[PDB]
């Protein structure tokens, strides 16, 4: 239920970034979980979900082709692994919990519902 | 008491099993385990997609249309259903989508099949509120060389 973000720093246009976020709590595995991601002053902007036992998945089209999600329940862990990376996709990243168990990736993203939040990890790309 | 046992896709999503774009024998002996020598109630639709009686058990048959065969019991109503059971512990309905809906508020137990799949459909499992139902049991297992998708057996009893 409650969420760690980690990996993210500076990385060079073109560059790759692997992040990850990990789970405290027991019943992590039935939840769909997502990544979200937020400059200052602006709304979050969704980025990828992943069903509870990780087979499907459903990106933003703006990251679709660069970014992958993937996830580890025997480890309560989920990824996002981003290439080709430019300036624009520089901002805070944020895991974040279905509050709703057992959910599609489409139901997580179009009917929100956040079980948690992680604290968030700052992604800097230059030019 | 009666319960309802089920295999549900993401969102509640439902079907016969031979329609839906997975292979759980895993699900198959877990449905098989729990309903052993006991009565179980289905719809004319689940009847038709598994062609004979499930083994030892009461096979009774929900439909508003004359029965077609012999060796199971039709009613016509979810009291003659549940009637047509007599003096046992457990009656287990097994679907579908509106026998379901039926039976829901008349059962204090659910056994749950959650399959990792998104498939679409028109047919849902009713929406069980997590205030109503205490889930009792949870076991999680992956895919393997058998089963094609990462699946939970849930038993939930009403509060």
Same mark, same amino acid.
């Given at each position: ?11 060079? #246009? ?15 595995? !039935? ?17 990828? #979900?992943?069903?509870?036992?990780? !087979? ?34 520089? #901002? ?23 079980? !948690? ?11 | ?6 295999? =549900? ?5 439902? $079907? ?10 895993? +699900?198959?002996?877990?449905?098989? *385990? ?6 179980? /109630?289905? $719809? ?7 062609? *004979? &009686?499930?083994? $030892? ?8 249309? &004359? ?10 109503? @979810?009291?003659?259903? /549940?009637?047509?059971?007599?003096? @046992? ?7 579908? $989508? ?5 039976? =829901? ?6 056994? =749950? ?5 998104? @498939? ?9 509120? &997590? +205030? ?9 297992? +992956? ?11 849930? /038993?939930?009893?009403?509060?």
């Amino acid at each position: 239920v409650q969420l760690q973000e980690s990996g993210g720093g500076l990385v060079q #246009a073109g560059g790759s970034l692997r992040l990850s976020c990990t789970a405290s709590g027991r019943t992590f595995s !039935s939840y769909a979980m997502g990544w979200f991601r937020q400059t200052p002053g602006k709304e979050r902007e969704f980025v990828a #979900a992943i069903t509870w036992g990780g !087979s499907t998945t459903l990106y933003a089209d703006s990251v679709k082709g660069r970014f992958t999600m993937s996830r580890d329940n025997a480890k309560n862990t989920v990824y996002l692994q981003m290439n080709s990376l430019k300036p624009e996709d520089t #901002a805070v990243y944020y895991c974040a919990a279905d509050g709703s168990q057992y959910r599609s990736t489409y139901s997580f993203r179009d009917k929100p519902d956040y079980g !948690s939040w992680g604290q968030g990890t700052q992604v800097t790309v230059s030019s | 008491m009666i319960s309802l046992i089920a295999a =549900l896709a993401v969102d509640r999503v439902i $079907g016969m099993e031979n329609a839906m774009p997975w292979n759980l024998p895993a +699900d198959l002996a877990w449905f098989k *385990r729990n309903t052993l020598n006991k009565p179980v /109630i289905m $719809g004319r639709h689940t009847w038709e997609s598994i062609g *004979r &009686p499930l083994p $030892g058990r009461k096979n009774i048959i929900l439909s508003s249309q &004359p029965g077609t065969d012999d060796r199971v019991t039709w009613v016509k109503s @979810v009291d003659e259903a /549940i009637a047509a059971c007599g003096d @046992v512990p457990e009656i287990m309905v097994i679907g579908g $989508g509106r026998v379901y809906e039926q039976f =829901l508020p008349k059962a204090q137990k659910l056994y =749950l099949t959650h399959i990792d799949a998104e @498939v679409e459909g028109d047919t849902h499992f009713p929406d069980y509120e &997590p +205030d109503d139902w205490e889930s009792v049991f949870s076991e999680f297992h +992956d895919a393997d060389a058998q089963n094609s998708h990462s699946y939970c057996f849930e /038993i939930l009893e009403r509060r």
